Amino acid sequence: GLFGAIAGFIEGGWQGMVDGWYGYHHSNEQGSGYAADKESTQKAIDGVTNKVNSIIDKMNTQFEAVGREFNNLERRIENLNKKMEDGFLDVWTYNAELLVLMENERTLDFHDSNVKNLYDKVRLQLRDNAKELGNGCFEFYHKCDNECMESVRNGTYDYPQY
């Protein structure tokens, strides 16, 4: 992906994190586990929701064909009518299919971005109090108990304290 996180330096996703799209896995002396970053997650849900509704709604006004019939000596206008109706269908078929392709690409990249930013958010807190392992993980120099871990997820990790 464009942002290098998903299926990049973070090799794979987690079956074990059920509760959100992005989050944290911690590991210390007390144990280990997954925790979803809800805010980053809810941001993503709001964006994708708005997108789908924007797509659906933009295609709201669109060509509706009507039945018109013509006799044996009105072939020209019958042909005109047919070419006209087919023409609009092809145009709207193109618009729909292309919008879906373009916005699918942007949706996948958007998730990649949200992961990258979450990783950097944590990196920028920890700074040189941890080893950046290069796989999505940070190994602490000090012991980091569950309250310490929570402060990382918080945005509250007190750097001068360690």
Place this chain on the structure above:
Amino acid sequence: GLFGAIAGFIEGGWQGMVDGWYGYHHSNEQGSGYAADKESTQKAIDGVTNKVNSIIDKMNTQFEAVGREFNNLERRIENLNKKMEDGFLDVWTYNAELLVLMENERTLDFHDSNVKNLYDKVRLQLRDNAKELGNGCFEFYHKCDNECMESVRNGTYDYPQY
């Protein structure tokens, strides 16, 4: 935003920087203040200007409706005419509204990108001669007077000197 700077690791904008879109705030023994990065700013102005003109100009050739009238026993072609003219208006209304939405998203992300790149530009000069605080700021290990600050804004920050 996609790039994580604007309303990301840089929490908010600056009312005090009036002279450009992106720039620097310095703080030392001599005092403090804002300075716009004009180049990064002028780059942004050129891109956005070109975009607006590209949008305006692409919508230059577009369907123009003409008045056509039909008698009481020409209802079929009157309907055809109406469906035809409405059809094109809806197509061009869609194109215009969707283009504005798509390019607005890209414009906001573009700014975010320019900020991220400006931040990295400075980071890549300073390297380990300053503490990356994680909020847009770099705290120097040495004293950095106004000429020192200017050399950062320059691209001229002499790393071996410190």
Place this chain on the structure above:
Amino acid sequence: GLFGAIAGFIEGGWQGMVDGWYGYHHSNEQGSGYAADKESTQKAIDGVTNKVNSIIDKMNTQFEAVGREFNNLERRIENLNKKMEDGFLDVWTYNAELLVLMENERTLDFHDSNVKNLYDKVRLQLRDNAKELGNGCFEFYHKCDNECMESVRNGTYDYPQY
């Protein structure tokens, strides 16, 4: 570019790397040279190839004009026919030109992204065993012979070893 690598912190491209789109330049006691990162490169070739074919193929179904003639007292429908055919040509001309513009922008950014990710890939292996110079280059603390260099290109750079 959006990702800050191409014509950013990497000032210019390399005439001397002929064999791929992205890659490495190494410099040690044994000598120096260019080496293409084929995998990143082939990824790019597959994406761009698919894009072109996607573009070509999406424009496959599109309005085809037919000749229709009208006498001197059929001016209204003649005008209708003309406005109809011109209308679709302008719509498909817009679609084609806008698709090319939009996807050209995304293609250039895609390359920028691939470079940024290749740079980070290497950064994340080396970590603190090298100086990040800020221009695309990493200066090693230890001697790095040709096998050492190859392990960087591999993904196999044994960090604990140094």
Place this chain on the structure above:
Amino acid sequence: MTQSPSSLSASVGDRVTITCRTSQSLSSYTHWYQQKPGKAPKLLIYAASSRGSGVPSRFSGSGSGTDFTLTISSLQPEDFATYYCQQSRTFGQGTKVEIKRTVAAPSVFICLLNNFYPREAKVESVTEQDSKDSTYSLSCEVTHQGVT
């Protein structure tokens, strides 16, 4: 780069497929060459599936992951050759395509093994396959699929 088989016999009109397994899969870098005896290789296929200039339509290539294939839809007498695959500056070992007949026992003289098929025999050098009768000759106890 590992090519398989190292050789084969097929009749005129036969469908022939040769395979190359590459270390790492890149579609664009892979290429095929056909070499007739004492001549330089000729580029046959490039980038896994593109036909070289002047290369007839019976030749095609395919690629999937690390496995690459060259296919001759209907073998012709002139397609007697060694075929090589290649990526970057690395070549496979080559596949000899000979144009296969009924098994023929060598006539043995003293040591000469004359007009035999297949090539594999145990007693040196061997002639190239004869253009008229498809046999080999080799220059004493002889073992062969078809004596002192």
Place this chain on the structure above:
Amino acid sequence: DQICIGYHANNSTEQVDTIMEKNVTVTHAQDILEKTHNGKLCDLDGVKPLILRD
């Protein structure tokens, strides 16, 4: 001893347009528009047309 990351350049003058920038020089490009014709009326797939002339 050092290792550096970089990208391809060449002597190309091909240019493409984008939304935000026009006449961007790129290393490679692909034209997709046919601009030329032979200027003649021809047999279509071997089957000659009816040319009514005057």
Place this chain on the structure above:
Amino acid sequence: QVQLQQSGPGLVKPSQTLSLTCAISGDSVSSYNAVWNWIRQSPSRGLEWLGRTYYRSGWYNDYAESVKSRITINPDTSKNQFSLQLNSVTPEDTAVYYCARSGHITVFGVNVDAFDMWGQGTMVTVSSASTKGPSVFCLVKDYFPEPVTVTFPAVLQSSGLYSLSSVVNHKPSNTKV
């Protein structure tokens, strides 16, 4: 059409220098859409790429790791050719040497190293034997260099002389039997 015309001696004494030339016609040695390569082939080693030169706003060379310390490949923009120089040769350098153009055919402007044109090849033999006519017993024994015409391919014996059988003309030694 591009043609590549090779020249240079096919006999080099052990420890000395092999020197070949490829003369180009129909293309420029300094073309931005060419790469100029040397490749060798031996019955043992198969096909082996040795090195290349090319011009992209300045001259570049790359060489195979196996020969890097002994090899030089230089362009001549006066005569539109390029050379191969291989120092300190040993019997293992006996092979057919081909020049070849690559990067004429590129995927999206990227040289894929697909060779599209090759020279005719120069057979190079690393040997000290000197010219010797055959004994004929037909068994054609103990001659140097190749070829003899009269029929099996010649074999190089541990003496460094060739032998073949035909089931006899040796032009290098001016001998006919």
